[PDB]
């Protein structure tokens, strides 16, 4: 047990009410993120395979951890009287997709296609593991600036994936679909695909398409930057008003705009400058 197996560093992130510290695993120097979660604001508890009462976030992290590098891995966790503490992998150097977009504006299609594809692979891997993220967005995506690999983070609004209707939601409103806004219901996959359309527009236009409830419900997309027709068609497809008109993961990945994606390595050399 105990907190001498990590050395705590500076607080990460530039705002918000959460607490995440840069850390280093004393045992082997592995860089890690130390995320503190308060009991008071966990609304969702689950119970572990061996049946302990933990935050849903932990149950979901444990279900998606494993060889595949597309989701940040939970390396360990500890409970305290008033909070849980989660130890996760930390790439170094790293930058979130929100900052990266703040710095570099709208991304070339080629870089968006490669980022977007790795996001699809990560989300497929969560779904495949029985986990629904429910807050896919540029702040919840890390870029490993050296290998050009993206990593999905923050399962704090997620749920077990199921085929029936969800009537609760706690993620980011401007990424949530029109069926949630109007009826307080949605289904997992189709909701996630809407958030993927918002994300792809964000990447190619440098900002999200909708801020207000009405624009979400209206679902009309205006492009403010030059964006190929195939990419605009994928986006409008993801943002179909009717859930059953959205594409599956498989159709998104077999879309003509998704062909000939760069490997992560090439993506970092070309767009992140590696060598
Ligand atoms: O689960 C997380 N949450 C957050 C916090 N935030 C709340 C604001 C944003 O949604 C995400 N950061 C991280 C994680 S894992 C992780 C791993 C490496 C690094 Cl460098 C940061 C993080």
Swiss-Prot record:
Expressed primarily in cells of the hematopoietic and germline lineages. Isoform 1 and isoform 2 are both expressed in prostate cancer cell lines. It catalyses: L-seryl-[protein] + ATP = O-phospho-L-seryl-[protein] + ADP + H(+); L-threonyl-[protein] + ATP = O-phospho-L-threonyl-[protein] + ADP + H(+). ATP binds at residues 12-20, 35, 89, 96. Autophosphorylated on both serine/threonine and tyrosine residues. Phosphorylated. Interaction with PPP2CA promotes dephosphorylation. Ubiquitinated, leading to proteasomal degradation. Coiled coil: none annotated. GO terms for molecular function: ATP binding; manganese ion binding; protein serine kinase activity; protein serine/threonine kinase activator activity; protein serine/threonine kinase activity; ribosomal small subunit binding; transcription factor binding. Induction: By interferon-gamma (IFNG). Strongly induced in leukocytes by the JAK/STAT pathway in response to cytokines. Induced by different cellular stresses, heat shock and cytotoxic agents. One of its GO terms (cellular component) is nucleoplasm. It comes from the Eukaryota. It holds the Pfam family Pkinase. Changing residue 161 to F: Decreased kinase activity. The keyword Transmembrane does not apply. Its EC number is 2.7.11.1. Signal peptide: none annotated. Keywords: Apoptosis, ATP-binding, Cell cycle, Cell membrane, Cytoplasm, Host-virus interaction, Kinase, Magnesium, Membrane, Metal-binding, Nucleotide-binding, Nucleus, Phosphoprotein, Proto-oncogene, Serine/threonine-protein kinase, Transferase, Ubl conjugation. This is Serine/threonine-protein kinase pim-1. It comes from Homo sapiens.
